[PDB]
């Protein structure tokens, strides 16, 4: 039941996870009937599907015998897992005029800082998938808002992920609102377009709290969501934005990603609990998920005490802390990291 | 272009006026083409429309042939051309995801201050319709927000007419609330339920202009209107509000109506230029829209200084004119002038 508290308070909670097995299954089905609300991959998340889930076992031998790349064996395997959870999904999604229900599906992390050759793998990939519940996930780098413009005044969703720094975010909502604009000014449509900005919690308190002080240890990472959500809020309700969403335009929703507790030393709820607020989505892994559903609380505590949240803000920027270029080297050991399980989840495939 | 610069500013543009042949000659469907959003009717333009539309005198011959009341007869012809009119209007309905492209049938003005039997009628006329984009008119007498609570309880998007008060507006939109919140609890969708307030704007002028001194007249009404959506804002950003958006609700819209431009010195498109802003509808009569597309201005003039429109109502207050004591009478001559053109219309299909 507190999947529904959460949405009755503005929240979808998404899996952070994906493999053949949980949808071939049943279990994914099963969570959509629980309250889960749509489903989010990455490299390292297919790369742990293809080497624990049995029943890839067929298809890469089948495909080991065809003249395909390994990044081909992949995507052949990987479209199949999306194209299936969002039949799945596709009932949810329908329900709510196309607000809900997403699979997202993350192009290669070598073309992170290639605006162009992300448009045109993100087109091939939306085609090969060819589900209206299908997001494309692309690193929010400024090659990343370069080509989100392009793919939304194109139609499609995306999932913009790998964010740490408000200045980033904002100048994706921006790239969006141009493409909605575009949409608006040759008479497409842009009801069904769908974005999210997956800006992430725990790796910025595993980045600070060794160098804080007690009173700050694990305060960083929900103050800055915090402070984004404001910042949304502001961007969103403003004439410009309000006058494209009075024509139908959808506004880009934050998204928690990174959610997962890594401190032992911290509730493993913290994250979900903390960050509860409107037209926001929080995407979890499946450990943290139980651990919501059986001792997590639904309460709106987003927009509770922001003013505290901005005080803890300037007391981090006080101690020396640039929470900017934080977020940059964040940004770019994160790429590295999806670029190391890229690698690693294409080697058996040779 | 213009309708689509007033689009561009967050404002629907609809046509006060529905008829058989507007409908069957597909000028509407053309009207659409150029921009057009909506259509609403009322007891008068139906009476209109029968006296003078030859269309209809095939159907009234056969239904006076049925054991029907006039009533019935009547009804039976207005339902048709509304389900003709929806069906013009869907594709564009559809393609904002429901936000435009809405028709709208008034009740009988006899059950103006009969609750019970408004709801009971709204129902039937709503099930009879059967189309996603009608909305049931109903006075906003305090019977009229009575009905409004409930209809909007069973699903029901209703256009609430003859506002003329800025007081009683702020009482629909908490019946309006007070609906939405039933239909949360009880796990039912609110997406599809749209409401709109038409605050009638040349009506309030006629009424006080030739008593008003020369710097006040054909001030009042735009006065009123500017002011009426600061009530908005602040009505539906507060808190209470803020919980039932965050589940899907809709905000109710003000839509400007009765902006036939009546007095010769005036401009005839005063109450469309004057009134533009972001999350509002303006229902006008052909003669206006064709003077609008003609050399109307689109520039977002409603939330423009709007402290003068604050001021020159209270000028008007000191003057001992009271708008609220106005807008009671104003309410009642036009429920009497729709019960006149009722009995007119109904008295030939005997
Ligand atoms: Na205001």
């Known amino acids: 039941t507190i999947l529904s508290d959460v949405k009755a308070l503005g929240q979808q909670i998404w899996l952070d996870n994906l493999s053949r097995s949980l949808v071939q299954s049943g279990e994914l089905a099963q969570m959509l009937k629980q309250g889960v609300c749509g489903v989010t991959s990455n490299p390292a998340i297919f790369q742990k599907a293809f080497a624990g889930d049995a029943l890839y076992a067929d298809e890469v031998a089948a495909l ?10 992949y995507e052949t ?9 969002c039949d799945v999904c596709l009932a949810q ?15 290669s992390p070598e073309l992170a800082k290639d605006a162009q050759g992300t448009v045109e793998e993100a ?10 519940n299908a997001m494309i996930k692309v690193p929010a780098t400024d090659a990343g808002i370069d080509a989100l413009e392009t793919l939304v005044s194109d139609g499609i969703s995306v999932n913009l992920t790998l964010l740490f720094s408000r200045a980033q975010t904002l100048k994706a909502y921006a790239a969006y609102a141009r493409g909605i604009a575009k949409r608006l000014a040759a008479g497409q449509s842009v009801a069904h377009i769908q974005v999210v900005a997956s800006f992430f919690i725990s790796r910025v ?7 804080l002080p007690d009173r700050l240890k694990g305060k960083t990472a929900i103050a800055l969501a915090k402070a984004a959500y ?6 969103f309700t403003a004439p410009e934005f309000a006058a494209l969403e009075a024509q139908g335009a ?6 928690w990603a990174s959610t997962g507790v890594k401190n032992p030393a911290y509730p493993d709820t913290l994250y979900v609990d903390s960050l509860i607020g409107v037209h926001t989505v929080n995407t979890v892994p499946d450990a943290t998920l139980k651990a919501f559903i059986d001792h997590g609380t639904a309460k709106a505590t987003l927009t509770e005490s922001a003013d505290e949240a901005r005080a803890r803000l300037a007391e981090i920027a006080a101690l020396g802390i640039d929470v900017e270029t934080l977020a940059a080297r964040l940004q770019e050991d994160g790429l590295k990291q999806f670029e190391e399980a890229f690698e690693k989840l294409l080697a058996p495939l040779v």
């Open 205 to 211: 308190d595993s980045a600070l709290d060794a160098t």
């Open 93 to 107: 999604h329908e329900s709510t005029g196309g607000k809900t229900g997403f699979v997202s599906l993350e192009v």
């Open 230 to 235: 404001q910042d949304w809020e502001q961007y």
């Open 123 to 132: 087109r091939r990939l939306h085609a090969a998938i060819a589900r209206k």
């Open 64 to 73: 080991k015998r065809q003249n395909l790349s390994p990044k081909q064996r």
């Open 77 to 85: 395997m990987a479209v199949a897992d999306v194209r299936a959870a």
């Open 250 to 255: 959808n506004r880009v929703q934050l998204l």
